[PDB]
A = this chain, B = another copy of it.
Amino acid sequence: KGAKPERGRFLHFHSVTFWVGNAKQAASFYCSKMGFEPLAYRGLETGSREVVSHVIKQGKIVFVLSSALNPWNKEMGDHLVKHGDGVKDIAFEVEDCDYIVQKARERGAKIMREPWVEQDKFGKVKFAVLQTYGDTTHTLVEKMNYIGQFLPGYEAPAFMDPLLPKLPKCSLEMIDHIVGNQPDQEMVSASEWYLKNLQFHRFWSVDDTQVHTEYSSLRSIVVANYEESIKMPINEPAPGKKKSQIQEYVDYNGGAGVQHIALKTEDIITAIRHLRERGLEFLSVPSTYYKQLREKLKTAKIKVKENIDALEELKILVDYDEKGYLLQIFTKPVQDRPTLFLEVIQRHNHQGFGAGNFNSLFKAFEEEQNL
């Protein structure tokens, strides 16, 4: 629902690139604990002498972990003092990369690297880099007759962990959305960047038909491409009954940045059962949430399809409306600062993001403390 742009097309998320302190051990964390697999590699052994990158894959989800190779790299070094580990760049796969770059320059988006083409044995890929909020960037990916595993300039993984094949699969298929926190009075700035320069559009869900700010302590504005596969909320703090997770994020980040990545699944019970086997840690949810959940469901128009005794067993959260529902869960922050975490979401005729769960978790904790 919008107005189709003239030329060009944002297909989907390509990859999320982490600038981390140790790329080697960080890829091991996301493979062992979150269910990814080594896909490609670039570093000293392939011809890249300044930057090393471990590309890992699950379903269509592609993470690439990057670290600097030489000492005293200003950009990568600075970024680690400010943010620690965290998301550096979000990549889109596009048709007609040239026009999209020319469109955004016309409206006022700075171009970090204008279109250039790399080539190898499998084809040629166009790339171009635009910058968004904080130190985050967007690199556009245009495949011009490419049939390689990932991208040019990458070879096979430097080491195949023999532990990964003995581990259960996590049923993570694609990236649902990615959240970017902003300081106050920058949510409008950060979101309209995508509307103005990229010709995205404001996405509306059942989250926006109510005010959950007293429980959410945040204001959201979700921005999506025309085909609406790339959904991407933009947050900023707001007065609420508890300390703002958005303000504390911007505090520990030093600025704006990606708060969490949403990995979609179609078997969220198997997903969370197997993630907890591998050793990933999720947020605690008191029994009050599920006592209260069964009460609401009696009056509810919809019915939850999964075994609700397994949800309480696995600490998966639930949110619904008149038409459908969604099941979501959150990991403990994947680093030590209260900055970035991740989300596993399964949708059942529901396009929301679980904004009603802010109130739900609040009532769950409130009755637990009171009892």
A residues whose Cβ falls under 8 Å from a Cβ of B? 20-26, 28-29, 32-33, 43-44, 52, 67-73, 77, 80-85, 159, 161-164, 251-254, 276-279, 281, 332-338
Q: How far is the CA of A279 from the CA of B77 in the complex (A)?
A: 29
Q: A28-B32, A77-B81 are in contact. Are A335 and B163 (CB under 8 A)?
A: no
Do B21 and A80 touch (CB < 8 A)? yes
Do A67 and B84 touch (CB < 8 A)? yes
Q: How far is the CA of A49 from the CA of B22 in the complex (A)?
A: 23
Do B82 and A72 touch (CB < 8 A)? yes
Cβ contact of A85, chosen from B21, B69, B163, cutoff 8 A = B21
Most chain B CB inside 10 Å of its own CB: which residue of A21, A23, A84, A162: A21
Do B43 and A336 touch (CB < 8 A)? yes
Q: How far is the CA of A73 from the CA of B82 in the complex (A)?
A: 9
Cβ contact of A332, chosen from B159, B252, B279, cutoff 8 A = B159
Do B21 and A22 touch (CB < 8 A)? yes
Closest residue to A162 on the B side, CB-wise?
A: B279
Q: A44-B336, A77-B81, A84-B21 are in contact. Are A163 and B67 (CB under 8 A)?
A: no
Q: How far is the CA of A77 from the CA of B73 in the complex (A)?
A: 12
Do A22 and B32 touch (CB < 8 A)? no
Q: Which 8 A-B pairs have the closest CB atoms?
A: A21-B21, A77-B81, A163-B279, A52-B336, A71-B254, A161-B279, A25-B29, A22-B85
Q: Can you list 10 residue pairs at the A/B interface with Cβ under 8 Å?
A: A21-B21, A22-B22, A23-B336, A69-B336, A69-B337, A71-B82, A77-B80, A159-B332, A161-B279, A163-B278
Copies of this chain, count: 2
Do B24 and A335 touch (CB < 8 A)? yes
Q: How far is the CA of A67 from the CA of B21 in the complex (A)?
A: 10
Q: Which residues of B contact A253 (CB under 8 A)?
A: 71
Closest residue to A82 on the B side, CB-wise?
A: B71
Q: How far is the CA of A81 from the CA of B84 in the complex (A)?
A: 11
Do B22 and A252 touch (CB < 8 A)? no
- Looking at the assembled complex, report how far the CB atom of A281 sits from the nearest CB atom of chain B, in whole angstroms: 5
- Looking at the assembled complex, report how far the CB atom of A6 sits from the nearest CB atom of chain B, in whole angstroms: 42
Closest residue to A43 on the B side, CB-wise?
A: B336
Q: A44-B338, A334-B24 are in contact. Are A277 and B81 (CB under 8 A)?
A: no
Cβ contact of A84, chosen from B22, B29, B333, cutoff 8 A = B22
Do B44 and A33 touch (CB < 8 A)? no
Q: How far is the CA of A85 from the CA of B25 in the complex (A)?
A: 10
Most chain B CB inside 10 Å of its own CB: which residue of A25, A26, A81, A83: A25
